[PDB]
Structure formats: C-alpha cells, structure tokens
Design a protein around this ligand. Structure first.
Ligand SMILES: O=C(O)c1cnn(-c2ccccc2)c1C1CC1
Length: 289
C-alpha cells in the first residue's frame, strides 16, 4: 500500500486514535476515531480494508476485554462493526492467509488463551481452528509462505522464548526452534524469508534486541538492535523495511518511530507519532479520501 496506519493504543487509558503516516513525505493524518477505545489490539489489512481486532478498553469507567472486529474503509473514512470473535482477546496477535484473518491467543481476565479462530470476510463469520500447543498472550504473529507463526508471549506463569507454526492444510500446530531471548509483547513481522522479533519484555527489562528466524535453516540470529528499548510496540513492513512504532521503554511511553534497513543492518529514527503510546495495532494500506 502507501500509508502506515496506527490504531488505538494506551497512554494513561486506552485510546481511540487512528492516524496514518506517509513514509514518502513524513506527514501524519488524524483519521476517524475507533468507536471503542482499545489497547492491546492488532491491525491487519484484507482487500484494502483495514481491520482492528481484539484488545481491551482500559478506562476510568472500567476495564473490558474486546472480542470486537472492526473494519475501516479508507475510501469512506468510516468504521463499521464486523462479526465478533468467540471470545475476548486482549494482547492478541493476528495474521492473514489467503484472505482470511487468524486471531491468536490473548487474554480475557485471568484466562490466557491457547485458542485460535479464523475470520472469512466473504461470509462475515469466525470459526475456531486447532489451538496452539501453548497459551500465549502478548504473542507476536507473522505469516510466511502461507504458514502462520506464533512467537513468544506469556502463558500465565512464564514469559516465553518458545515459538510454534500452524499448518493450515493439516490444522496442526508444531513447535519451531525457540528464540535466543525471552520476549513478551514484542513486534513480530516478516521480511524476505525471515521472521523478525523486535523488542519485548523478558521478565526484567524492556529489550532493544532484534532477532530473526530463517525458515530454511531453522536458526535465530540477532541483527542490529533498535535505538530504543521497547515493549508493546507496533510493527509493520513497508517497501522492504521494518517500521517500529511507540511502546514502553521502562520510563516513557514512546512516540519514536524507527526504521530498519536490512541491507545496511541499521536502524534510524524516521518520525515521531503525535503522542507517546504503547499497545497499538498497525497495518499498511492505501491512502484515504
Ligand atoms: O508483560 C508481559 O508479559 C506482557 C504480555 N503482553 N504484553 C502486552 C502486549 C501488547 C500490548 C500490551 C501489553 C506485555 C507487556 C508489554 C510487555
């Protein structure tokens, strides 16, 4: 697409912001608020529509985990409700395969989900699939070669360096090589043939380290670290580069947006969000009207 969309997030309370960043010219646009404030959600794009999935409304009025799926049409600049998931999923991960959205893990109160469900836009309907082998909240999710990966997170008792892979034609989950680092609330994405895991929380510290999984060799290798330690960051890929957005560094809710160039193995700061925040959902699609 053309723009990096950031939805929701958290600073003092859950937020309703939708804003879109244009890497070509450095500009930010403020777009139509989410109907319901939510942090800990995930964003993804199917057929040019942007989707916001799950999360939680942390508010003075109270705290409500979200089963919601909402859809934003850049042409109209309007949000519409879509079918809700079977269960609320705060701190969810999502991935898209063959036009279908997979919702993975997340929490509902003290329940840490291993369950997974799949949305079909053509029918506006969700169906459960096989659960992960591990309960995971704050899980990173990415798709590569039409396989779905769940990376890290928190199972209820321990933060995790473990990861696993879902094979749709077999409806089966299998463990892959674990990361070299425990990461909960990291940013996970795909670039070229590798699954990237940036930042997160290892139980004691927010991380600036980044590592990547080569599906051919099944090994994790560290690359250059981010300039800022971050957990609960947003992440996405745009024209061959990874962008990380916001997060919490142990002291400040970050407005920093960093960009990773894999040919030079360097990060640089490319812009700042209009306000520091963590727990955003991020995806890339066309510019609005
Ligand atoms: O502390 C954890 O283990 C954990 C689990 N999920 N998330 C999270 C993930 C996304 C958004 C907000 C929070 C966290 C904290 C960010 C570290």
């Amino acid at each position: 697409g053309r723009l990096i969309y950031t939805a929701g997030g958290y600073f003092r309370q859950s937020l309703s912001y939708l804003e879109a960043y244009n890497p070509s010219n450095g500009s930010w646009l403020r777009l139509a608020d989410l109907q319901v404030p939510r942090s800990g959600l995930a964003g993804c794009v199917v057929g040019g529509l942007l989707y916001a999935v799950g999360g939680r409304n942390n508010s003075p009025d109270g705290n409500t985990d979200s089963s919601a799926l909402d859809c934003y049409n850049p042409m109209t600049n309007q949000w519409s409700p879509c079918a809700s998931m079977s269960v609320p999923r705060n701190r969810i991960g999502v991935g898209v395969i063959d036009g279908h959205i997979y919702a993975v893990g997340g929490s509902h109160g003290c329940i840490h989900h291993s369950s997974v469900e799949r949305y079909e836009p053509e029918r506006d309907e969700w169906h459960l699939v096989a659960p992960m082998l591990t309960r995971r909240i704050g899980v990173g999710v990415a798709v590569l070669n039409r396989l779905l990966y769940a990376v890290g997170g928190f199972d209820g008792t321990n933060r995790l360096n473990s990861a696993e892979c879902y094979y749709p034609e077999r409806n089966e989950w299998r463990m892959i090589t674990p990361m070299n680092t425990i990461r909960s609330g990291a940013g996970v994405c795909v670039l070229h043939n590798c699954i990237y895991a940036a930042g997160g929380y290892d139980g004691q510290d927010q991380l600036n380290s980044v590592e990547r999984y080569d599906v051919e060799t099944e090994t994790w290798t560290f690359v250059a670290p981010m300039r800022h330690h971050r957990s609960a960051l947003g992440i996405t890929v745009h024209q061959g580069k990874i962008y990380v957005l916001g997060g919490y560094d142990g002291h400040t809710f970050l407005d920093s947006v960093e960009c990773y160039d894999p040919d030079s193995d360097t990060w640089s700061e490319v812009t700042r969000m209009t306000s520091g925040r963590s727990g955003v959902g991020v995806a890339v699609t066309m510019e609005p009207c």
